[PDB]
Amino acid sequence: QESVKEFLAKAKEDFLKKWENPAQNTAHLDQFERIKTLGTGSFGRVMLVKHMETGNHYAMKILDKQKVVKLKQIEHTLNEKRILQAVNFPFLVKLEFSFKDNSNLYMVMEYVPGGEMFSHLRRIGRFSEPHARFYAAQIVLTFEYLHSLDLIYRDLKPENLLIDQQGYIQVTDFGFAKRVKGRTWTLCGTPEYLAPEIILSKGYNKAVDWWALGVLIYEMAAGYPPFFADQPIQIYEKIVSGKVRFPSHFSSDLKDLLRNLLQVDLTKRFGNLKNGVNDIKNHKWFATTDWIAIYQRKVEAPFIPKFKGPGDTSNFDDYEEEEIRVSINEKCGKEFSEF
Amino acid sequence: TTYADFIASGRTGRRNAIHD
Ligand SMILES: CC(C)C[C@@H](N)C(=O)Nc1ccc(-c2ccnc3[nH]ccc23)cc1
């Protein structure tokens, strides 16, 4: 048995070694069979693929270099790959291979067949407080880990939380994650999840991730987010107004935790104070949570997705399938040299 | 109800990230 201080110290030594000497060019597109698109958007696409050499399935994130440049995501993309190849935690999807070709950048991660929390939460409607707390404890531990390595995650939401066959969470999508000791200023995130200090264009720090945890716990427990509207500008007005309403079925403990996470005043927001994450972990809402048992995956999960077989994609929606075009000329060579 | 207001809203599907 070791302390958390001691676990994190060793975790930092492990991380820094990979951070300072990143892995590069560890596979080639030709080793993979394409099966199905799992997600798309202007920010890239993710495809289910099979590795011929092992028969393993993977989730391959594909980014078009020229579109990354037009979206001003060059440095964010180098961040994502550099950080992901360096981290190691039970609730983070693992990066298995990365490489690039003339046209695209590729990150090959482990495939999580249970799907996004997003789809289960929306169908079922809402999670019970014990169910929500099980998931929230995993994010609390993950943020403890990431934050200790000077990493900010900046995109927590149900869309980015996959449910594995044991019913535990895997965080995916590190496209806005960043290693920063001071403050930082980029406008990024998702509207419903943005802290007031992002909206107000202040320099901000890892406290934005703790605010986003409050939004997530609310959304999981209520079935809808604490600030919603038809357009983002209207969401921002609600977020900065300083007001929140809880459902009557929320426990007293839950409301009190959420008041301290959805706290506009940075000198008062849980996560950010002298006692750090322990203000959260020692809160009464988490009194039943055995943090080691969660880290060890020894707790029985409240929900187990349906298996159906290796490669089955039923727990994911259908997307339009698009070619993987590889130009015969190298694009953006300088910009992505370190990838 | 707040649920009905959310369900009638245009932001009940997967949400994209923002950027400037
Ligand atoms: C890529 C974005 C810029 C586009 C976004 N809209 C999106 O689709 N993200 C997304 C994230 C994870 C998966 C996924 C599904 C199953 N198992 C998995 N293992 C590891 C990742 C994974 C699929 C899609």
XYZ file of N, CA and C in Angstrom, chain A residues 43 116 118 122 157-159 176 189 191-192 219 224 229-230 319, chain B residues 2-3 5-6 9-20:
96
model
N -13.747 18.944 -36.658
C -12.535 18.631 -35.892
C -11.957 17.218 -36.143
N -20.636 5.846 -25.951
C -20.516 7.074 -25.164
C -21.545 7.080 -24.032
N -22.974 9.623 -23.330
C -23.949 10.505 -23.946
C -25.182 9.705 -24.368
N -28.948 9.938 -22.423
C -30.083 10.542 -23.141
C -31.250 9.564 -23.279
N -17.376 16.318 -20.893
C -18.796 16.186 -21.274
C -19.110 14.705 -21.511
N -20.385 14.326 -21.440
C -20.761 12.902 -21.631
C -20.316 12.334 -22.984
N -20.218 13.187 -24.021
C -19.789 12.768 -25.352
C -18.407 12.143 -25.338
N -8.076 19.491 -26.731
C -7.806 20.778 -26.082
C -6.935 20.649 -24.834
N -13.623 24.727 -25.558
C -14.425 23.898 -24.704
C -15.752 23.684 -25.373
N -19.955 24.764 -25.064
C -20.683 25.875 -24.425
C -21.310 25.553 -23.081
N -22.051 24.453 -22.998
C -22.701 24.108 -21.744
C -21.720 23.906 -20.587
N -25.765 17.315 -14.949
C -26.329 16.706 -16.139
C -26.611 15.225 -15.945
N -30.498 16.802 -17.770
C -30.305 17.989 -18.594
C -29.232 18.846 -17.919
N -30.034 26.294 -23.484
C -30.773 27.248 -24.309
C -30.606 26.779 -25.748
N -31.245 27.489 -26.681
C -31.150 27.075 -28.075
C -29.856 27.543 -28.724
N -23.000 7.036 -39.271
C -22.474 8.269 -39.850
C -22.203 8.058 -41.334
N -38.912 21.475 -16.723
C -37.584 21.759 -17.258
C -37.164 20.675 -18.240
N -37.506 19.420 -17.948
C -37.212 18.326 -18.878
C -37.869 18.594 -20.227
N -38.749 21.329 -21.525
C -38.087 22.460 -22.168
C -36.773 22.008 -22.819
N -36.001 21.165 -22.120
C -34.765 20.629 -22.685
C -35.056 19.760 -23.910
N -35.677 21.529 -26.986
C -34.599 22.438 -27.401
C -33.807 21.822 -28.561
N -33.003 22.648 -29.237
C -32.176 22.191 -30.337
C -30.813 21.646 -29.934
N -30.560 21.491 -28.639
C -29.238 21.078 -28.161
C -29.329 19.821 -27.309
N -30.148 18.853 -27.734
C -30.244 17.569 -27.042
C -29.383 16.481 -27.683
N -28.807 16.737 -28.865
C -27.847 15.836 -29.469
C -26.408 16.128 -29.092
N -25.514 15.340 -29.696
C -24.096 15.476 -29.367
C -23.651 16.886 -29.669
N -22.861 17.450 -28.753
C -22.496 18.865 -28.796
C -21.063 19.047 -29.269
N -20.868 19.951 -30.221
C -19.532 20.211 -30.731
C -18.791 21.206 -29.869
N -17.467 21.075 -29.870
C -16.642 22.067 -29.197
C -16.608 23.381 -29.971
N -16.274 24.453 -29.249
C -16.166 25.792 -29.813
C -14.700 26.175 -30.004
N -14.471 27.331 -30.631
C -13.134 27.877 -30.888
C -13.325 29.260 -31.506
N -12.294 30.110 -31.425
C -12.375 31.453 -32.029
C -11.573 31.560 -33.339
